[PDB]
RNA sequence: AUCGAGAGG
């Protein structure tokens, strides 16, 4: 919904690597794999945490209440 | 709803003892010790050191159910050797080895400083 | 020393790759299980929500807060809640934090773990600080606020181990390997046409001699050398993680010995 | 359940220490039985797991469209480049003793879904709660604190075992069991049993001496009363006239 | 929600079958199995 | 077909024979055709076996037809169950079907017969005919909530 | 307490059939004519090739109770051999007028021995310690 | 009517139905404060005392086996053979 | 039908079930919340005052406790509102509705209850989870999975009812089924897939793991077995430490096609005195097999022993598999390259062969699609066999097929070689359109690809046409699960109602509720269906010369003479006209039995179900009384000949001083007497089975004892048991067929509607036929 | 040679629920039907405005994740924006018999 | 209560 804190499979913190991931994707024009490797996410259990995530919070932030 | 408390894995009860020692009549000089609030972390480690004793004829642990945090350890030693003494010797050997490993790791980390 | 030996081949602030020697498999496995499970850490435990206009549930935010890594270098000085003659909150058994956020900006306002503020008296202890490892200086993204939305939380962080909850575990992942070559024949490799060309050669194969070609099977050999790589979430330094793991295992063994002596 | 009809329920929840681990520290989020697939023939599950492993490692998005030219031989040639066994197998170590396993375990990411069915919304137990007003039997439904139906097939199964007291107890003590007074002459449930006075009367045949009591299900009593209301006399007699 | 919005019911064996003419008009796989198999279809 | 015939040396040999199979049954006329074996002709229509050979041959044919269906894939069911099923369908001198027409029209108590099918009609007929129910069946003791004469309740225990 | 059958066998064929650590060897006695052996052997612990010579001895005892791990100090028996197995005899067949055959099962590995009268001390006892020397 | 003690043509072995009914009846009677005929020692569960009594053949009950025609045969529990 | 024959009951619970390898066969795991809701009224006695009053003071909150205290008058003291201490001290005759505790008999059921094994008595074990945890071997009678299934628990509320539950409906008492006289419970799933990998010649275990596995056996006697290999390294074979679970005194010999005393391929089975001599343990041995280990341990010893054996095997095998592991992946379905092209050829020519067949088509009838469908099925089967043969032994799906835990040959063929031919309603895909099956084919096209032949495997993937054809074929597997299940449940209900009142009376006759005699002896022999094994009659078969050499003894001529080495007095046997008179009468009896059995069994089949297993008793006598073959016997001819004759008069099924009952007795035990004389002839007891006097007496005593245990117990509800045993195979045979999704099973399509004819004596037969010779 | 039409794509014969299955042609048809039935019981974000609706029995997964293996039809079904599952790490192993 | 829908083994 917001950002998957930690990692179910292991426990590594990945909640502080979302804005950096987006900046790498957009500002640095890198692809998903290179951006994920440049963030220090080596294990594919952590890699899927940021690779496959839907940031629905923004949509929930578009309502008046 | 029916899930047990997660602090029941490492907290003793009201009248619950960490070790329950019962003589075993299946084999001579054998004993079964039930360890409460324990896991495979400290059952395999004790069994491995018990098997390293030349005066131990049998040593094996088991957890009867994963729901409950306890395990039974059967120890059978050579006649004239108290299995409690075997357990004490195994624990002392584990403590000495762990202390040596701590000292060696501290020395290696100190040398590792760039 | 005399028994176990260590060789730190890689050391960073988050990973330690070392090589244990002169140990049995049981000791190494017990050490890694202790490092995963039974080394104490400080983490948020009780969240009181005073104001929550956000689009996130109170318990959602509480669960996210509980997973935030907090500094726990001096965790050994605090007391357990069960063993403290105190109440739900105190100074020698818990750390009190306060989060106050308001969406004043027109755009989305991010609430980070950096915004957490320690309120209780630390009494000169290096404990209870949100951990910042991002280069931007921001911690973990706790939440987001649109405009006029407010978050007011009082958090109580208590000492605990990873057995009770995974939020208290400071070991992210502990790589553990032994016998890179299949000398001991503890594994029967699955193959289609060739077993040596279909299975990738592990890196640790560079540290052992290949098993020759036709030498007879060595049935008297046991596992002695273990290649380990310990990570840390950040609450406890990696060297402190491994040292406290060894200390906790030693404490468990000594507690059993003491119980036996008392009986 | 996965996206292939591979449904299941949690049987145990091991912690991270007790779970098998690979040489790089990955611990499965879920363990499924190998015996599930060979009869279900859900090869798409394994292909999806392999493709998901490749996609997670490479960072791309796996294309699982049905009628494409993507083949398992093409996915395997991509997984091997990343440094893994081409068929998805991975050497995993035991979580208890830390020893290698002789069999390499199929390991990888798979998309799983949580279904609406949970035990806390299915568990039920009844200890003589509310009952119906018509048949005086246990009410129906978990939400109504009702009991479970001991249907005819269950009755036949209990007959096959040759247990006669359990069947009666399930039919009398567990439900109904309303005693009725029977006249010794007409045999109908007409006796005006005025208790607290020790007087029983059966107008219509002037029988105040031959009265018995029988323990029958309330459903049986209501059946007999409905038969009486339909101009039929189900006369219950205690003794046997013809052997 | 989408499946409900694109459902079809036949008020009624041969009817509970996947006919050859359902190619591309009715989903061959999506159908209930709660005694309404084949009678309820999805576009 | 192949038939196991005892050879003159005592062994069993699969000798071959020619067996004709027809589409349609005229047993009472085919059996008298010269050149065939009248003692080995068989029909899958067990009704025609009873009308030509008797109820006992009808019982044997009924058991054979039941066996050919229960034990066709290779499944095995003990002979006792099929034998009892065939016997129940034949103790009245004719093929008594397992249907409300065949076995529900017996002299059994009306409480057992009304629990299967045609409940109200059976009860009406019992009331009109004043049928007496001996309460020896299982259904009759189930409706009355009594210990049926089933195993463990098929005897009395005194002191 | 003593040996029951000591002989020397020359191996003629080694069969690795469907098993990676077990091979079924066939051997013929070097000294006496009609004496053959068909034995399953753990190749990993004791590799056996073709045309090898093996001294086989039926110890039946090493001089009932729970087995005790070997300890320093004692010698017992099976100290000059290379491969020792313990199993139960389960069949005594009469091959011919002057031939007998005994079957042993060392935990699942089967052995068949054939002879004329040298197989006289072999009785149907679990006491059988197959000793093999290179 | 009633078959005499002789001319009884029924199995002297106790059927499982008879054994189970006897055990249940004895267990129910014992739980209702009936005189136990055997030294119960440590046993407290009434079914256990019933089994102990059956093993020593001290249950004073009797089975009335009913023939289809209505006649019956009385077999003592002590008389019956239990296997 | 809705309120009297079936009611809603109190003291019942329903919950999702899950497996538990650490639970006994007869145990069930009850959640704590359910155990605190369901209650049992216990009468206070001098033997339980303290426990009952402590439960009362516990209250209805703590699990060991009570919810009510019923007084003698009838008033109930609720322990949650009213006071529960003080003068609450109990008095004799009061009832205290306690919470359910450990070791309580509870009925346990799963719908639909197609047979009596779907409803069994289990033993309560309180657990901390909302699941009805149960053993993995008891799931077969229930037909239960752990993927959402829910089950029901009924609590008896009396002392008689608990005894009835624990003495008739107990799980150990239901191990052997009376339907097919074979066990209905066996080792299943993982334990079956490990039992064969633990019991290979290639499996060896070191001391440290052997100690743990030995400790995991609760009945282990504390004696370490001597390792199979001693000097180079102490190693225990898997059969060595698996045999610790097998009880002492169990003998079982199995010989497959490749089985020899040396069993090169480890075929067959040989267990001597509870020790596995050779053979890989698989479904044929430790499964629900006709003559496997479970049947022997159940028939012999006790069912409880067998129940203990289930747990002893499961714990060891599951512990071994925990530290070994077992998986399954894509590479298990990939066949070798060179072995794939052959498969393609194995298809292609067959397809072209079908082409030739259609040339015969041009010049109701059918006899073409029928033959073409058969050819395509044979092509699929031979391709699957070619694929399975060339699969390596370490292949994980092959190991599951070898063990029999799950999967089969058809699964291998469909996942690796080809899916095959898709058929709906018993016929291949019909022309829904005009002269074609799909709009992508030309009209008048009869090629196999055009009418539903899937040439591809699941690994390769199905083309859109083959995908649609497979969907069409597999939908039929779901229709007969929701539509045709009602047509086989009505059959079973009619069968149950027709045979509801049938039972065995105390005069050993089978009667209706009116007293009408259905059968004069149940099953024409009066034997319980659970005490019967398939046994061979040696007299019926073989040559005349072979039979003579088998059973003919002549004490006067050298033609057929007893070896004096066999019998101690075998030196003075020669001559002795009285002994020849006693010895040729038995040969005449054997000849009469041979001709009688050849009359009864026209085809000459020798293997028939009979009550008492005699080979097993012979083996038990040989092992128990240690017999040396190199020693003369101790049996006089007058003892072997007259012993069997005296035994034949002790096989009493019917009792009566009249002549009708005596003739019925002679007729009843007649074929069993033929078997007995075939197995206990003088030559057999002297030469083949070198028995002694003590061994012979023991054999006779055991035969007499076990025969008297197989007689049906008066009170059996035969009709309900027979009705369930007929409709249950049909009901479970249907409600399946989604497991294969396209294969042609005529017995679910044309099998059950034939049962609808016989039961209703259908006047018109779908296809009448007359067979003339 | 007498083709009169061509199909846009063969995979457009499936429905809404069956278009979520990855590699449905490598799967037994009853399994596809089972998933189509179970695809409507998967828990996820059913609507973005779930916090405004007063509807009975609303279930929302904490962290919905887009599938790692996606079909090309998922773009038009909005499954990558309102997913109903998570990418677990599954191991196929007979670990402990549970 | 009635009716109906949908859904699980
Ligand atoms: N219409 C029905 N009538 C009676 N019983 C049914 C019916 N539908 C399902 N069942 C019960 O549910 C079980 C079906 O299980 P399920 O639907 O899970 O399929 P399965 O055979 O377990 O295979 P899989 O789990 O692979 O689909 C049967 O054993 C049966 O007892
Ligand atoms: Mg439905
Ligand atoms: Zn991770
Ligand atoms: Zn405090
Ligand atoms: Zn009256």
Residue numbers in the entry:
A (entry chain J): 1 to 65
B (entry chain K): 1 to 114
C (entry chain C): 3 to 265
D (entry chain B): 981 to 1223
E (entry chain B): 491 to 502, 509 to 539
F (entry chain A): 1287 to 1445
G (entry chain H): 2 to 64, 76 to 146
H (entry chain F): 72 to 154
Can you quote the paper on this entry?
We developed an affinity-grid method employing monodispersed single particle streptavidin on a lipid monolayer to enhance particle absorption on the grid surface and alleviate sample exposure to the air-water interface. Here we generated streptavidin affinity grids with monodispersed single particle streptavidin (mspSA) on lipid monolayers, which allowed for high-resolution structure determination of challenging samples. Affinity grids could alleviate both issues by enriching the particles on to the grid and keeping them away from the AWI. Taken together, we developed mspSA affinity method which enabled the structure determination of archaea MCM and in complex with dsDNA, HIV-1 CA Di-hexamer and ScPol II EC, while providing essential insights into DNA replication initiation.
RNA polymerase II is the enzyme responsible for synthesizing all messenger RNAs in eukaryotic cells and constitutes the core component of the transcription machinery. We added biotin tags to 5′-end of both template and non-template DNA strands for the attachment and enrichment of the complex on mspSA affinity grids. This preparation method resulted in particles exhibiting evenly distributed 2D projection views. In contrast, most particles on the holey carbon grid tended to adopt the same view, consistent with previous studies. A 2.98 Å structure was determined for the sample on the mspSA affinity grid. However, due to the severe angular distribution problem, we were unable to obtain a 3D reconstruction for the sample on the holey carbon grid with the same number of particles.
